[PDB]
Specification:
The protein is of the alpha/beta class and 257 residues long. The protein has one domain: Alpha/Beta hydrolase fold, catalytic domain (Rossmann fold, 3-Layer(aba) Sandwich), CATH 3.40.50.1820. Helix 2 packs across helix 4. The longest helix has 17 residues. The protein binds sodium ion (NA). Sodium ion binds next to strand 9.
């Protein structure tokens, strides 16, 4: 049952560290691609399987190296992950959406053959930090063929996204760049009530929390990607009946349980 199932039955511990797949990396040079600023692909190796893909955007003024840990973390749990650089580090959220869109096409059509051979391009998802998270919401609304969207400490001036793509948002309690009351929470509460949606808020975290190894971000991102990109119900346990001391708020419409 479930052709997309990969890796062992999960434990909470296992989801806070790199997973069972060896990871290869490929550098996409900035000038080799029109449509986005290049980036790094983290993808499984030593294996005959194919896996879903994820395009992931860094935040305002940031480089792809800022999410390198999470690009590696997700790939080692069984995903082909492209962390982009933006055409300009000053690009806003909707520009970032367009570049994720280009990056997804690139993964499908133009990435190296060793990458393409590991990818099932029928199963794609998006994630992003800050302004990259605002881009993540925009593209989920523009392109509902995406399997999941994970905005991290997201920023956008538009507060309503009418998308059917399952969304999990990570807010940071002490975030002063994109305050959760202005940004993350309105995004959560304005998504359609028929869309599977989860909001998690990190206790005592600021806007830079996604920029380094973070256990909660690791668990909830892996779990959401696994549940929706791989249809993997072994991961519902981390997302249902949640009682997590790391969190200072949790909201859900419970469609995923
Ligand atoms: Na709080």
């Amino acid at each position: 049952s479930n052709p997309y199932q990969r890796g062992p039955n999960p434990t909470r511990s296992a989801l806070t560290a790199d997973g069972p797949f060896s990871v290869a990396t490929y550098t996409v040079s900035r000038l080799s691609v029109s449509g986005f600023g290049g980036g790094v692909i983290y993808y499984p190796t030593g294996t005959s399987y194919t896996f879903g893909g994820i395009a992931m955007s860094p935040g305002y003024t940031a480089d792809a190296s800022s999410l390198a840990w999470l690009g590696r973390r997700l790939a080692s749990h069984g995903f082909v992950v492209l962390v982009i650089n933006t055409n300009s580090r000053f690009d806003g959220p909707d520009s970032r959406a367009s570049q994720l869109s280009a990056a997804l096409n690139y993964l499908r059509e133009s990435s190296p053959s060793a990458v393409r051979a590991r990818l099932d391009a029928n199963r794609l998802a998006v994630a992003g930090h800050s302004m990259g998270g605002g881009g993540t919401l925009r593209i989920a609304e523009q392109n509902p063929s995406l399997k999941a969207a994970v905005p991290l400490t997201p920023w956008h001036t538009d507060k309503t996204f009418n998308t059917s793509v399952p969304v999990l948002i990570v807010g940071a309690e002490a975030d002063t760049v994109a305050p959760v009351s202005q940004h993350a929470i309105p995004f959560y509460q304005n998504l359609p009530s028929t869309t599977p949606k989860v909001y998690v808020e990190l206790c005592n975290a600021s806007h830079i929390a996604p920029n380094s190894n973070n256990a909660a971000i690791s668990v909830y991102t892996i779990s959401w990607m696994k549940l929706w990109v791989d249809n993997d119900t072994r991961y519902r346990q981390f997302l249902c009946n949640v009682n997590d001391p790391a969190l200072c708020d949790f909201r859900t419409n419970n469609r995923h349980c």
